[PDB]
Amino acid sequence: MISLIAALAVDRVIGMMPWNLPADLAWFKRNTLNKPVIMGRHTWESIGRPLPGRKNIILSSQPGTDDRVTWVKSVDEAIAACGDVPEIMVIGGGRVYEQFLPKAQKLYLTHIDAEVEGDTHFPDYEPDDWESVFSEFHDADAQNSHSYCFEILERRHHH
Ligand SMILES: Nc1nc2c(c(=O)[nH]1)N[C@@H](CNc1ccc(C(=O)N[C@@H](CCC(=O)O)C(=O)O)cc1)CN2
Ligand SMILES: [Cl-]
Ligand SMILES: [Cl-]
Ligand SMILES: [Cl-]
Ligand SMILES: [Mg+2]
Ligand SMILES: [Mg+2]
Ligand SMILES: [Mg+2]
Ligand SMILES: [Mg+2]
């Protein structure tokens, strides 16, 4: 099964960080550890080093040479490279989320209370097609710059 995981500012702006949220990074790690992660080449270059404890699959029509990750050229190849696993995590960026959304059955979202200047957005999804099965709000604190709300949604309908 395919899931997307993303952190969204107001207006669904995503980035590679205008905010400083170690709690969100802990949420990201907890929910991706021991699962393959699929990302586009822009996201890969922004991370710079393979995420530990996860198979790192990079979707790009023009692969790099880095032997530390697995390079694939299509959504279908990305999925095949993951093989028989319970859950595949798609970690962005904008275009990769857009291509994978139709195949996804679960969303892990962090809704951040920040207005920011970026131009890359998380895909449009029809809220009526999803059910909110978890939500938790957290205030900002000495370690986290903004307030945020974790949410998990499960797909109920497809169009
Ligand atoms: N929800 C959440 N989802 C996201 C992002 C986020 O920002 N938070 N940002 C994008 C993914 N980018 C990264 C880049 C680096 C790391 C990262 O470095 N993670 C460490 C945890 C950080 C640490 O404490 O060292 C890890 O092992 O997962 C996580 C997401 C897309 N989705
Ligand atoms: Cl957590
Ligand atoms: Cl990308
Ligand atoms: Cl505090
Ligand atoms: Mg090689
Ligand atoms: Mg889009
Ligand atoms: Mg769309
Ligand atoms: Mg319904």
UniProtKB/Swiss-Prot annotation:
One family name in Pfam for this protein: DHFR_1
Annotated residues for binding of substrate: 5, 24, 49, 54, 110
Cellular-component GO terms for this entry: cytosol
Effect of substituting residue 151 to Q: In strain: 1810
Domain DHFR intervals: 1-155
Residues binding NADP(+), per UniProt: 7, 42-43, 60-61, 73, 92-99
EC number: 1.5.1.3
Functional pathway: Cofactor biosynthesis; tetrahydrofolate biosynthesis; 5,6,7,8-tetrahydrofolate from 7,8-dihydrofolate: step 1/1
Annotated effect of mutating residue 39 to Y: Increases catalytic rate almost 2-fold. Increases catalytic rate about 7-fold
Effect listed in the UniProt record for changing residue 27 to G: In strain: 1810
The protein's enzyme class: oxidoreductase
Reactions catalysed according to its record: (6S)-5,6,7,8-tetrahydrofolate + NADP(+) = 7,8-dihydrofolate + NADPH + H(+)
GO BP field: 10-formyltetrahydrofolate biosynthetic process; dihydrofolate metabolic process; folic acid biosynthetic process; folic acid metabolic process; one-carbon metabolic process; response to antibiotic; response to methotrexate; response to xenobiotic stimulus
Any one GO molecular-function label of the UniProt entry: NADP binding
Keyword annotations from UniProtKB, A to Z: Antibiotic resistance, Methotrexate resistance, NADP, One-carbon metabolism, Oxidoreductase, Trimethoprim resistance
Family note: Belongs to the dihydrofolate reductase family.
Additional notes on this entry: The strain K12 sequence is shown. Strain B [RT500] is resistant to 500 micrograms per milliliter of trimethoprim.
Cited function: Key enzyme in folate metabolism. Catalyzes an essential reaction for de novo glycine and purine synthesis, and for DNA precursor synthesis.
Name this protein carries in UniProt: Dihydrofolate reductase
Species per Swiss-Prot/TrEMBL record: Escherichia coli (strain K12)
Gene: folA
